[PDB]
Amino acid sequence: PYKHFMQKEIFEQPDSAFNTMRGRIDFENCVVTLGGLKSWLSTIRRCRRIIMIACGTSYHSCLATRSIFEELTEIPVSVELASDFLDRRSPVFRDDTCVFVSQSGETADSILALQYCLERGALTVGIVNSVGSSMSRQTHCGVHINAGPEIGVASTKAYTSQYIALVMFALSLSNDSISRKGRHEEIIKGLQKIPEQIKQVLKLENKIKDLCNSSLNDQKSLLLLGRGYQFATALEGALKIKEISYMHSEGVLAGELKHGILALVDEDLPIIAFATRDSLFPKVMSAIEQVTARDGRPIVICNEGDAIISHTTLEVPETVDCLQGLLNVIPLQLISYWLAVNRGIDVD
Amino acid sequence: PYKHFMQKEIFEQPDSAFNTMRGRIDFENCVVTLGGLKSWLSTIRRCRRIIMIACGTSYHSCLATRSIFEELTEIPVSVELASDFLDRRSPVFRDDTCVFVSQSGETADSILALQYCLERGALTVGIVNSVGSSMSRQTHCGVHINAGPEIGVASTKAYTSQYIALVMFALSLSNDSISRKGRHEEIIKGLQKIPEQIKQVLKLENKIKDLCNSSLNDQKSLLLLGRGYQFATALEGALKIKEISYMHSEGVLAGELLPIIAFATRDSLFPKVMSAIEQVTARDGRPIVICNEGDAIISNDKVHTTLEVPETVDCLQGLLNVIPLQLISYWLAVNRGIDV
Amino acid sequence: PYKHFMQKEIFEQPDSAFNTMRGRIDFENCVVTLGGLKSWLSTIRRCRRIIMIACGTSYHSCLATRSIFEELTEIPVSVELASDFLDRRSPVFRDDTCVFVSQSGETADSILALQYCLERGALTVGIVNSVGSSMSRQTHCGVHINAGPEIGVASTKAYTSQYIALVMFALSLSNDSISRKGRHEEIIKGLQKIPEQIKQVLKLENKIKDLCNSSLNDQKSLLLLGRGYQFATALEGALKIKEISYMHSEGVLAGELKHGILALVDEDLPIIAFATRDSLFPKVMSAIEQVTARDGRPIVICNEGDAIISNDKVHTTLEVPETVDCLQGLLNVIPLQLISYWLAVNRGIDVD
Amino acid sequence: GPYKHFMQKEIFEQPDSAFNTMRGRIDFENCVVTLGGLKSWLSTIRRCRRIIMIACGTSYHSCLATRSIFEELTEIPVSVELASDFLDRRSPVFRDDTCVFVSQSGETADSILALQYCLERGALTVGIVNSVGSSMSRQTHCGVHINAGPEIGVASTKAYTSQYIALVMFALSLSNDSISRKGRHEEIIKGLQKIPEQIKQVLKLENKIKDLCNSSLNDQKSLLLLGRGYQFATALEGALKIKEISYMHSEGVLAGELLPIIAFATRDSLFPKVMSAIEQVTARDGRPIVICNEGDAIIVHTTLEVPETVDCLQGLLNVIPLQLISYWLAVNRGIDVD
Ligand SMILES: CC(=O)N[C@H]1[C@@H](OP(=O)(O)OP(=O)(O)OC[C@H]2O[C@@H](n3ccc(=O)[nH]c3=O)[C@H](O)[C@@H]2O)O[C@H](CO)[C@@H](O)[C@@H]1O
Ligand SMILES: CC(=O)N[C@H]1[C@@H](OP(=O)(O)OP(=O)(O)OC[C@H]2O[C@@H](n3ccc(=O)[nH]c3=O)[C@H](O)[C@@H]2O)O[C@H](CO)[C@@H](O)[C@@H]1O
Ligand SMILES: CC(=O)N[C@H]1[C@@H](OP(=O)(O)OP(=O)(O)OC[C@H]2O[C@@H](n3ccc(=O)[nH]c3=O)[C@H](O)[C@@H]2O)O[C@H](CO)[C@@H](O)[C@@H]1O
Ligand SMILES: CC(=O)N[C@H]1[C@@H](OP(=O)(O)OP(=O)(O)OC[C@H]2O[C@@H](n3ccc(=O)[nH]c3=O)[C@H](O)[C@@H]2O)O[C@H](CO)[C@@H](O)[C@@H]1O
Ligand SMILES: N[C@H](CO)[C@@H](O)[C@H](O)[C@H](O)COP(=O)(O)O
Ligand SMILES: N[C@H](CO)[C@@H](O)[C@H](O)[C@H](O)COP(=O)(O)O
Ligand SMILES: N[C@H](CO)[C@@H](O)[C@H](O)[C@H](O)COP(=O)(O)O
Ligand SMILES: N[C@H](CO)[C@@H](O)[C@H](O)[C@H](O)COP(=O)(O)O
Ligand code: NA
Ligand code: NA
Ligand code: NA
Ligand code: NA
């Protein structure tokens, strides 16, 4: 019933999200159990630091979850792009836990980075979609995300499923803390509602098809503004637009520069801003204002009922702050898909 | 005899680079001595990790020197933008060494980041230009970079002076290792020549003026391609272009996925850089290539502009590579009638 | 009504044990709150390792609680004798948490070790009885143990109060762990019973007095056998006998050597063995059997009701209430304090 | 050979076993230590939260004798555990611990149980073992075979001094990248070069020690050994030897912290508290046996003079008269030490 595998995969997300969590979360007692990590957790905690290493959209899923790992675990977490990690010859030692995120489990730069960490004595952990792929075999332990196959060239359901797996991994690491208990529960109860909220967000597709037809198809570039939890989503949205739609795009840290890209925008170029409550910073408001003043008409992704400015609005349900990126990425997936098909591009 | 403070400050770099090292490097014996830090070095090293925290060009100087800190010290080093560091409520603890880089020592997010780290019991180190500014006073210890006052609106000499001070800090932290003695000597001997090499690089100004006179100056954006040590230079070039020239620009990790400037000096001449360049020459895209004197990155059968710079030690190459970008950003602004 | 400050201080222990815990343990909700440390706990935890540093009986209170600190916190814990720490010039750094235990807060070697750690940038924590003493002032934070003044020359109540404060510190450090909750609850409920159990143990005095009036008073040496939690108690018992009774004494790790001191002892050499359930190891039973095999007549400190040596073999028992394993040392040391005291009295020594 | 007992042979063999332990491993001219068993593991061993040395009996003493030099040269926390007590406390161990197991036999039950405990917990394990291919040798990740040759006497003698040498070489190897350590490294390496000949010289104290053991010293019930600092381990090991071989009670005491008396008063460990303890003894006219450096007048007493070596190597020489005293006290008391 679907034009492309990509469209099918986007629409499959309530199912792929549920299947990633299946058998792993007791939503009643609020307990997370990851069979592949279970016996390794005590060891994983006992590291100097966690280094998340990935390429492309998997690198984004790491940026999207870095804050929650830091918050729940109080272990240092850094996020490396695999190729740049190898280019710097970054030192790795026995006391590092290196977490490798990959949909295919076969990306050359990820495998090379893995081999480098393995040779240095680090503990290695895979978060991988292709069961028994090279990355799954070669990591010491890990989690198969169970999202099913992706045929679309750009990753959609693997991003949301990876992000969920990474959240479950952070919850697992912090499952012995009294002080964390209430935050754990909050997140777990939030995760329970994600698949249905994704169903809801997918109902934006008509408004999105209209927006592309009326304001976007014709455009050479588009700028995405985000901060905090939503900066990763701005980078991922930009990558989707670039890969699928063959249009220029850039994710920008909102309001970081006064005199930067926004002091230098046309009253014409399309701008999408993340203004959901989890990442509604004064710098995001100033960025939006600097657009409206200039007579740009921003596209605002925000939570249902919110009045961000006096523009096009795409409303999404409100979830737990660290989960909001799971909902906010979906309209960007749909935008990139429709922009591409409306240009005769094959997305499969 | 300069039109603007920015032009004066760019041309001051052989002197500011020299002044940053003055009294701190024994070039004969290859000994670095940072008075502000030396009784603190054993404690700085005894940390779980180093967090470099800064904004803007100062954040770039951190990115430009991260690899040499990690290489020489084998201490984990992460680099944070002060505002994003705060947005995440990044936990920090007694075992962190937090290194704050700031020309002014007054930038609001850098200050708030500092106070946050201090409240959490971290050791704090300032790399600061304004002596006795907030950041200078409130950090436990530090190095004044001694670049002199910087009055241009965009940072030029403070970037190259911050980068030098950071390399001296990394050398200081690693001064007890026999295995890294040769690498220390290499870098220190390389640093001695940087001021005279900056003088050489400033000799590109005429070629750069000729470039900024061309229809380059009516472009809406400029892309900069770099990788490894030169990725920070690409990000900093793009900031200068946006800040000064009012032209859009983006620094791109070369080959990871309209005028184009590509960094192709030997320190950062990766296969991915070459393939990115080839992609541009395949569509006869006429790239501007920053490369080392005498290296033909692109054949004569493709139109391209070359800006040759001296070869230095790999982790010092960014000190020279940033200079043409400073000059391009300045002359683009002048050609566009911008009072820099 | 007491003959000496030392006697009074021994018999004051139900009250001092209570006083150390007072206002710090919610026994109903099982919460420990140490005001002196509360806001420093997250920082104390964030260390490479804990170094306990002390002299004499205060050093023994560290040995007596090392295992529970290790168990509850999973942070490396080492215990140093202050003078030896200084002799080795042991390297200390910013990532070390240094814990100084001292009754007086004025012992020279403890103060020198503190200054050494302070100047090296380590976090320092005092567990001190004398309020506002040098160690109390100079440590970053700490717990005043609240045992009251100790006038006896040998430490009695400050030992049990230090030991309790250290257990409370260990509980405070591990109070965020779900997996530790049952162990915390077990220990805290145990602590609540310690003051009344100390009172029970003190009822042993008549038996001990009779024993000190025995063939025991005549001999020149006494060996103590202990393992595990009770090794510290053997060392502290030997120190008390040496310091107070002026008799030679040695605390011996039980059954460690098959042909060590026990293969050499005279039939009539006085030997005290700790055989309470918390430290009743096969090696302890081995050592005890080696003693009785040679016709030795050991004194057995064991839990109420337990038969460690057959009634067929001559031996003395001093029975003590059973408590939580890591708290048993609080009860087991009491008879040694009383033995050292009555051995001294009977030899004319003035213990004050 | 011309020796009455294996134990006597093995004592007198120490110049040779000390040399053999070092052979092929120390370049004395260039001051370079190379331990083949460790070469590829050193960078990893250094990257640990801490080092735990774990051993029994005399091997536990060799850890105490070298703890200080490990701490000094490496700035890694070093703790020393008796294997049985380590197990008794169920002391936690983790991935980030380097656990160093010292054993002559490589077969001691508590040492093997402690090794398996550490292995299951994911610690890096390092063996310092005399019997090649023994349980401890095979099952540690990496290690150094001490090359002392077979030891048949039941009190360890040559295995103590060879374990102690092996451990010092291990400490030197861990700190071989430090510029600030270089002078100290060279001092200790030049010191080690002279140890075998210095042990030859100390063995010439034998007649003086026989004279001492012919006296009423052999009729005593207890012998107290006083030491501090580097020489505390020596005092413990001396006491163990007297108990194991001589069947006389002995205790190693930390000098001046609180009957024949031996006091270690060599310059490496000549603390105020040692001098105080010695004065206490002479004040009551107790007649101490003093082990001190050649030419030193420490203070009726007996003096056993030993050559001066580097502070952290002095234990290697000081232990030798204790081994001889234990052996001749046994012979005088009619005990077959074999
Ligand atoms: C492969 C397999 O039989 N998985 C079963 C396992 O799933 P479970 O979810 O427990 O484990 P995973 O499928 O995630 O992992 C399988 C194994 O692969 C390792 N691993 C995984 C990913 C990675 O990147 N690297 C890596 O080493 C894990 O540590 C584990 O040993 O128990 C479930 C019942 O609860 C079953 O329904 C699953 O079919
Ligand atoms: C400011 C000052 O009087 N500097 C003097 C210092 O230079 P020197 O180069 O030794 O020291 P710096 O100027 O770098 O540092 C001055 C002091 O400020 C501290 N600090 C510095 C920067 C920072 O961000 N945070 C921070 O805490 C340093 O730890 C130091 O205590 O000794 C020289 C003599 O050898 C004199 O010529 C300089 O005039
Ligand atoms: C001595 C004192 O005023 N104690 C008061 C403190 O008891 P509380 O039990 O809260 O505190 P302690 O007496 O244990 O500690 C007093 C102070 O001294 C510090 N410290 C203590 C011991 C040490 O060795 N080193 C050290 O630095 C502590 O960190 C603290 O700042 O607050 C209570 C209010 O609830 C009062 O009833 C107590 O009278
Ligand atoms: C046993 C062996 O083959 N030794 C050879 C090795 O000596 P070399 O001195 O190089 O090595 P060792 O004999 O010390 O150790 C041999 C191996 O056993 C390991 N190990 C050792 C002790 C221990 O307790 N645990 C442990 O795992 C080492 O890591 C190494 O892999 O090369 C020399 C030539 O260069 C040969 O003369 C020796 O015959
Ligand atoms: N086109 C996709 C992104 O949607 C690619 O960029 C991948 O994300 C990138 O190659 C990493 O792939 P991986 O997740 O299989 O390791
Ligand atoms: N305009 C400059 C860039 O050249 C700014 O981005 C500064 O670099 C940034 O504000 C940081 O300032 P600082 O170095 O004084 O803390
Ligand atoms: N005589 C007593 C023991 O009872 C002494 O050993 C002290 O315990 C020792 O001096 C330590 O004193 P302190 O706890 O005041 O620091
Ligand atoms: N009798 C000897 C000591 O002289 C024993 O104490 C051993 O030292 C002890 O059994 C350890 O043996 P090991 O070094 O073979 O592991
Ligand atoms: Na695997
Ligand atoms: Na300062
Ligand atoms: Na204090
Ligand atoms: Na082995």
Side-chain angles (χ1 to χ4, degrees), chain A residues 47-49 66 70 74 80-81 83 87-88 90-91 109 227 248 250 253 256-257 261 264 283, chain B residues 47-48 66 70 80-81 83 87-88 90-91 93 109 227 239 242 248 250 253 256 270 272:
Chain A
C47 54
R48 184 153 188 174
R49 82 209 178 107
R66 176 189 193 189
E70 306 173 299
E74 300 181 358
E80 299 264 1
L81 192 63
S83 66
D87 301 338
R88 299 192 334 274
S90 184
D109 283 328
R227 178 168 285 280
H248 183 250
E250 179 180 357
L253 192 62
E256 182 65 16
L257 307 179
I261 193 167
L264 275 19
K283 280 189 192 75
Chain B
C47 63
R48 179 158 189 159
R66 186 192 184 192
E70 285 197 319
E80 300 269 359
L81 191 67
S83 64
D87 295 344
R88 289 193 277 114
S90 203
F93 298 101
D109 283 333
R227 174 170 287 276
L239 178 50
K242 293 191 272 176
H248 171 264
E250 192 186 353
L253 202 61
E256 192 55 20
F270 294 93
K272 288 192 181 93

Side-chain angles (χ1 to χ4, degrees), chain C residues 47-49 66 70 80-81 83 87-91 93 109 227 248 250 253 256 261 264 281, chain D residues 48-49 67 71 75 77 81-82 84 88-89 91-92 228 230 240 248-249 251 254 257 271 273:
Chain C
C47 67
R48 190 154 178 157
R49 47 123 191 207
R66 185 193 186 189
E70 297 177 311
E80 299 270 351
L81 187 64
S83 65
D87 296 343
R88 300 198 334 278
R89 320 159 262 112
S90 187
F93 305 95
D109 291 325
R227 171 168 292 277
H248 180 247
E250 185 179 350
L253 189 74
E256 184 62 22
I261 196 160
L264 310 175
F281 292 91
Chain D
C48 64
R49 187 157 180 156
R67 187 192 182 188
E71 297 173 306
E75 305 189 349
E81 302 270 347
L82 187 71
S84 67
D88 296 338
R89 294 188 271 107
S91 184
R228 175 166 288 274
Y230 284 120
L240 182 53
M248 179 188 294
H249 168 261
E251 193 188 354
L254 192 66
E257 184 66 15
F271 293 94
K273 287 180 184 77

Side-chain angles (χ1 to χ4, degrees), chain B residues 24 35-37 126-128 131 135-136 139-144 146:
Chain B
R24 289 167 170 173
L37 299 178
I127 304 289
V128 180
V131 168
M135 299 294 303
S136 173
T139 39
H140 289 94
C141 63
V143 175
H144 294 122
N146 291 340

